[PDB]
Nucleic acid binder design. Structure first.
Ligand SMILES: [Mg+2]
Ligand SMILES: [Mg+2]
Ligand SMILES: [Mg+2]
Ligand SMILES: [Mg+2]
Ligand SMILES: [Mg+2]
Ligand SMILES: [Mg+2]
Ligand SMILES: [Mg+2]
Ligand SMILES: [Mg+2]
Ligand SMILES: [Mg+2]
Ligand SMILES: [Mg+2]
Ligand SMILES: [Mg+2]
Ligand SMILES: [Mg+2]
Ligand SMILES: [Mg+2]
Ligand SMILES: [Mg+2]
Ligand SMILES: [Mg+2]
Ligand SMILES: [Mg+2]
Ligand SMILES: [Mg+2]
Ligand SMILES: [Mg+2]
Ligand SMILES: [Mg+2]
Ligand SMILES: [Mg+2]
Ligand SMILES: [Mg+2]
Ligand SMILES: [Mg+2]
Ligand SMILES: [Mg+2]
Ligand SMILES: [Mg+2]
Ligand SMILES: [Mg+2]
Ligand SMILES: [Mg+2]
Ligand SMILES: [Mg+2]
Ligand SMILES: [Mg+2]
Ligand SMILES: [Mg+2]
Ligand SMILES: [Mg+2]
Ligand SMILES: [Mg+2]
Ligand SMILES: [Mg+2]
Ligand SMILES: [Mg+2]
Ligand SMILES: [Mg+2]
Ligand SMILES: [Mg+2]
Ligand SMILES: [Mg+2]
Ligand SMILES: [Mg+2]
Ligand SMILES: [Mg+2]
Ligand SMILES: [Mg+2]
Ligand SMILES: [Mg+2]
Ligand SMILES: [Mg+2]
Ligand SMILES: [Mg+2]
Ligand SMILES: [Mg+2]
Ligand SMILES: [Mg+2]
Ligand SMILES: [Mg+2]
Ligand SMILES: [Mg+2]
Ligand SMILES: [Mg+2]
Ligand SMILES: [Mg+2]
Ligand SMILES: [Mg+2]
Ligand SMILES: [Mg+2]
Ligand SMILES: [Mg+2]
Ligand SMILES: [Mg+2]
Ligand SMILES: [Mg+2]
Ligand SMILES: [Mg+2]
Ligand SMILES: [Mg+2]
Ligand SMILES: [Mg+2]
Ligand SMILES: [Mg+2]
Ligand SMILES: [Mg+2]
Ligand SMILES: [Mg+2]
Ligand SMILES: [Mg+2]
Ligand SMILES: [Mg+2]
Lengths: 183, 148, 141, 124, 52
RNA sequence: AGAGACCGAUAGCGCACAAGUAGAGUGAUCGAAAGAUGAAAAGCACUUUGAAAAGAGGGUUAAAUAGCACGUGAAAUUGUUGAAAGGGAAGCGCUUGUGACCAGACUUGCGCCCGGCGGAUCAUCCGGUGUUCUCACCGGUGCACUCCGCCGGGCUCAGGCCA
RNA sequence: CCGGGACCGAGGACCGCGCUCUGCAAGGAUGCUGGCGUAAUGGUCACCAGCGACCCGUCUUGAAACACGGACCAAGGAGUCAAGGUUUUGCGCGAGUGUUUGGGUGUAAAACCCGCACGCGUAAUGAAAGUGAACGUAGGUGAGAGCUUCGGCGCAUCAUCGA
RNA sequence: AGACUAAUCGAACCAUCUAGUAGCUGGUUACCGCCGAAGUUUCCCUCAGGAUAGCAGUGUCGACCUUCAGUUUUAUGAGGU
RNA sequence: GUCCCACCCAUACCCCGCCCUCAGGGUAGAAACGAUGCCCUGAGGAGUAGGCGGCCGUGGAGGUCAGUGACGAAGCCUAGG
């Protein structure tokens, strides 16, 4: 006997992508070599984000990029391991160069129209193997419809599952002191 | 595809994953929404607070066409003009001509105002207009006129 | 481009017409495959540079791939027949694969495959007659 | 020909793991089945009963799948298949399928003798 | 008889795949690996001068 | 009338057959079982034992280990022959012993030296062609201390099982 | 510091730490010798011997039970399908997205092509009439991966004070 | 006499609605590998049954955050066996 | 009743071999690789109700082995491997 609390405990994070895209398999091979034989911490972070599922790689927008292109960051390279989306509100698009997993049709057109350049994760490794002069970005993880229903309960101000919304669907008892109590 | 499902892995194990003491009988607890006020109250109050009761006055023979007025904010107003003409105005090449936007033809009735507007005069024709939206379009040199 | 040697291996890694998979191991019945194993290193039909040896009526026949005419298969093989001497054939094959950097990692396998083919064209000796151990008493009658 | 030099072969077990209570009823085959009874004496590992198969009975990875000669069996169907063993004659051995005709059986044996490949079932 | 026999797939994905298949038809190594006999054809995108 | 990622004689309609038939009930009604010799009956002439059914010979056939109880013919249960055990159950697990039966492996391989037999052709050079542009093939030139195959003799190294 | 006995030999070019330093007991067994080359070693099956071994499935706090079902063998025999939800995985497009009610066409229940409407999404809140989202570089403070001209800029998300 | 009404009577026999409902008995079909419980809280014409929290498994993400603990030591409070 | 020497044996403890599970490292100016591979190092293994992963068989459908067969396919019997 050995009197241990835990035994044969597995890891908690993905160690390989669950997707079977052939091109993505090549991209993992490249960065798996780079991370092993380079001291730059930028390579290790990029490798893990390639494994993540779609809900853990939310899209980023052109507006969110322009937000972080201020206060002395107008000359750096934006790297986004996700999709990049055009924003209809932004009327004037600044000049930037972006390395992203994929672009929408309109986002690619508007970036190069202003005088920018659209890169690729493989071309990024060819130009900046150590990731110098780069900034990483993420999308809003919690900006999803399904997250609003998480942890429903009294005094929590969450969203309920209703087949429709109106005065006939819930409200009533338990939502106003005029009928019993409130939550 | 039934070749890969948990019922195939239960072969050879008695009770098929439903337990020995509790034997998966026909309908314990009732059918449907039975027991809403008696024995399923604890579930129906932690979730779904408000199932029971009456609220508000009733409407006989409601016709939803009387209440049709989709709305559009002001920061998306410039997205209505086509892209090729749109870039000319923002670049600043006209300097003497103003566009007239017809909201009804695009399927809108009320013009709300939520974002910002560039300083170019426009003309908006809407059935309804908000108080805040009228001011922003006016300080840019434009005017809004009701059309019915 | 969108096609490369690495990509073709990804598509054909799991199944292809040349695959012979069963218990105790897997094999490949490919013309440009030395040792007839299923691996990226020995998969002739995916790599840009490959070697293959086929027995002729008298000696070995060696075919190689010309990288300049990949899209033209009718004239994409450089073939030559060696039927002079065992040692002379050994030297030409090794030089063909390890003197100008054309798959220098296949030098050892190409020579060994040629050695086996030539060994298999010799006359066969007659196997000695089988003996009996427990049926000897039976056959005494 | 003789096979490559290798470490000695150890089996760790020879018996066949018969099924419990299959020696008393004719409706039960001898193929092993895991007993799921709540009070079964074999499932509870009582002393003096049949053992149960475990992963600890496995064989060495070096000598796995090889017959006592030292080779590994390979099922063949015609004369074109046996030529796949040209480069593997010290590791693999040929075996003719049971549905091959008698005429094609001697064609394979003749070709296999040239390559030095051992044939497991040739005396016929 | 009212089980789901047919299936529905997006027209965008149909066009992606039929375009992917056409690209793989110009790769000679893939042709051989599918069991075709093309050892004596001049060019892998074979074209005939409208003799038919 | 045309079809199938449908079932294949305990399945598919109750019915692949003289099936809503045989049969049960006073009656309304209830309602089965049952497909396959061979390519072709060529479905066993004649002799002999028997009261007869049938048997033994002899025939037809690619086959009667297909004979109208007919393709293939499994298990429960039974008969004969051969082997073995048994003082109020039998079976089973771990480990030897005796008797019967049996699969492998080994039975040579490589290299060097001497002698003999048989052949065209080893280094080198010239011309032509191919190719990874410096590496090869083909034609010619060699012409016996070189190269190649076989046989006989001698020597070194390695090779099966138990100690 | 010197004797006596038992069990074991994993690994497979060189590399290292060291020593008593023409070498070695120092990152894992080599050297010499004999009998036999077949039923001899080894394996399967039957029986005798030493030790061990209560009848399975099930409900139950507790089953070998004087608790219930089971004489034997062969074939049949039990979490399925549709509509509507929900979270998670893969894929296409992305402020948009969905061809197939229908029309064009066809080698014809396949495949390929076309568009007006419409569904969900892009704006909430009140019983209702109604009204309808920027003081600031879309804010301030404390932590934050990564980047950096070394001063600093600070994604996602968590807490807190405001508009 | 609750007797008799085709071997059927404290409400005949035949087909259909009908695969009538069951909080209750019985059964529920191949192998190997890793983790591994509960009979307790609150409400119910509830006590052979359900919902609710707990104990359990799997999928992950945030950092590798130096944070943590069925424990001892030192200083300082509460209690009525 | 008390005290003192020697000895006997568990699936427990120590050393060695092998299997699987889990964790941490090495491998491209590729003479290179079922990169899902191979090589190096350490620790762990009981289990009903229940959860998840990997694999083996049966009837059909598309592709492919230019697969086996009247010189005998499928099926069945077999203290023969
Ligand atoms: Mg242990
Ligand atoms: Mg009231
Ligand atoms: Mg279980
Ligand atoms: Mg049960
Ligand atoms: Mg339950
Ligand atoms: Mg009540
Ligand atoms: Mg075994
Ligand atoms: Mg028990
Ligand atoms: Mg049948
Ligand atoms: Mg029938
Ligand atoms: Mg029958
Ligand atoms: Mg059947
Ligand atoms: Mg019937
Ligand atoms: Mg009648
Ligand atoms: Mg019959
Ligand atoms: Mg007769
Ligand atoms: Mg007579
Ligand atoms: Mg016959
Ligand atoms: Mg006859
Ligand atoms: Mg017959
Ligand atoms: Mg009969
Ligand atoms: Mg018969
Ligand atoms: Mg019998
Ligand atoms: Mg007696
Ligand atoms: Mg007994
Ligand atoms: Mg014995
Ligand atoms: Mg010459
Ligand atoms: Mg070891
Ligand atoms: Mg013996
Ligand atoms: Mg006893
Ligand atoms: Mg009791
Ligand atoms: Mg219990
Ligand atoms: Mg019991
Ligand atoms: Mg009793
Ligand atoms: Mg009981
Ligand atoms: Mg009972
Ligand atoms: Mg009984
Ligand atoms: Mg029975
Ligand atoms: Mg009996
Ligand atoms: Mg059955
Ligand atoms: Mg559904
Ligand atoms: Mg729409
Ligand atoms: Mg409203
Ligand atoms: Mg930092
Ligand atoms: Mg009375
Ligand atoms: Mg009657
Ligand atoms: Mg009567
Ligand atoms: Mg009545
Ligand atoms: Mg009735
Ligand atoms: Mg039922
Ligand atoms: Mg019923
Ligand atoms: Mg276990
Ligand atoms: Mg455990
Ligand atoms: Mg009970
Ligand atoms: Mg947990
Ligand atoms: Mg007191
Ligand atoms: Mg007290
Ligand atoms: Mg032990
Ligand atoms: Mg261990
Ligand atoms: Mg079927
Ligand atoms: Mg047969």
């Amino acid at each position: 006997g050995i009197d241990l609390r835990w035994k044969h405990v597995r890891s908690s994070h993905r160690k390989a992508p669950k997707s079977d895209n052939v091109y993505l398999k090549l991209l993992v091979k490249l960065y798996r070599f780079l991370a092993r034989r380079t001291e730059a911490p930028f390579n290790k972070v990029v490798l893990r984000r390639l494994f993540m599922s779609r809900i853990n790689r939310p899209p980023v927008s052109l507006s969110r990029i322009a937000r972080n292109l201020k206060n002395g960051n107008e000359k750096k390279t934006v790297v986004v391991v996700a999709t990049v989306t055009d924003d209809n509100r932004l009327l004037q698009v600044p000049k930037m160069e972006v390395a992203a997993l994929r672009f929408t049709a309109k986002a690619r057109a508007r970036i190069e129209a202003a005088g920018g350049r659209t890169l690729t994760l493989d071309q990024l490794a060819l130009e900046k193997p150590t990731g110098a002069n780069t900034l990483l970005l993420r999308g809003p993880k919690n900006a999803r419809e399904a997250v609003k229903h998480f942890g429903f309960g009294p005094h929590k101000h969450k969203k309920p599952y209703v087949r429709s919304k109106g005065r006939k669907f819930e409200r009533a008892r338990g939502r106003r002191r005029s009928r019993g109590f409130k939550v | 595809p039934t070749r890969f499902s948990k019922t195939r892995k239960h072969r050879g194990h008695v009770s098929a994953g439903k337990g020995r003491v509790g034997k998966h009988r026909k309908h314990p607890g009732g059918r449907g929404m039975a027991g809403g006020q008696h024995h399923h109250r604890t579930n129906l109050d932690k979730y779904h607070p408000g199932y029971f009761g009456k609220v508000g006055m009733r409407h006989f023979h409601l016709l939803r066409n009387h209440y049709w007025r989709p709305s559009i904010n002001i920061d998306k107003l410039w997205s209505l003009v086509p892209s090729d003409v749109r870039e000319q105005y923002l670049s600043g090449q006209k300097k003497d001509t103003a566009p007239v936007i017809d909201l009804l033809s695009h399927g809108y009735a009320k013009l709300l105002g939520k974002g910002r507007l560039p300083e170019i005069p426009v003309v908006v024709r809407a059935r309804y207009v908000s108080a805040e939206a009228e001011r922003k379009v006016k300080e840019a040199g434009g005017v809004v006129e009701l059309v019915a | 481009s969108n096609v490369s040697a690495d990509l073709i291996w990804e598509v054909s890694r799991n199944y292809n017409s040349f695959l012979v998979k069963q218990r105790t191991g897997t094999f490949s019945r490919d013309a440009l495959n030395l040792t007839n194993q299923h691996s990226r290193k020995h998969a002739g039909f995916v790599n840009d540079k490959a070697l293959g040896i086929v027995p002729a009526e008298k000696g070995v026949k060696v075919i190689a791939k010309k990288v300049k005419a990949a899209n033209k298969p009718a004239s994409s093989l450089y073939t030559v027949t060696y039927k002079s001497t065992a040692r002379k054939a050994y030297k030409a094959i090794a030089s063909q694969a390890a003197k100008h950097g054309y798959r220098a990692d296949l030098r050892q396998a190409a020579v060994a495959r040629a050695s086996a083919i030539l060994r298999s064209q010799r006359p066969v000796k007659p196997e000695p007659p089988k003996k009996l151990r427990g049926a000897a008493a039976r056959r005494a009658a | 020909v003789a096979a490559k030099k290798h470490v000695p072969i150890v089996k760790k077990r020879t018996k066949r793991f018969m099924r419990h209570q299959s020696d008393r009823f004719k409706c039960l085959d001898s193929a092993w089945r895991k007993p799921k009874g709540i009070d079964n004496r074999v499932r509870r590992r009582f002393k003096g009963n049949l053992a149960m198969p475990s992963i600890g009975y496995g064989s060495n990875k070096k000598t796995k799948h090889m017959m006592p000669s030292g080779h590994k069996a390979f099922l063949v169907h015609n004369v074109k298949d046996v030529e796949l063993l040209l480069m593997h004659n010290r590791t693999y051995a040929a075996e003719i399928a049971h549905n091959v005709s008698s005429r094609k059986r001697i064609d394979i044996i003749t070709r296999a003798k040239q390559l030095g490949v051992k044939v497991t079932n040739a005396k016929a | 008889i009212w089980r789901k026999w047919h299936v529905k797939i997006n027209q965008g994905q149909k066009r992606f795949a039929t375009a992917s298949a056409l690209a793989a038809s110009a790769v000679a190594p893939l042709l051989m690996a599918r069991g075709h006999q093309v050892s004596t054809v001049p060019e892998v995108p074979l074209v005939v001068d409208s003799a038919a």
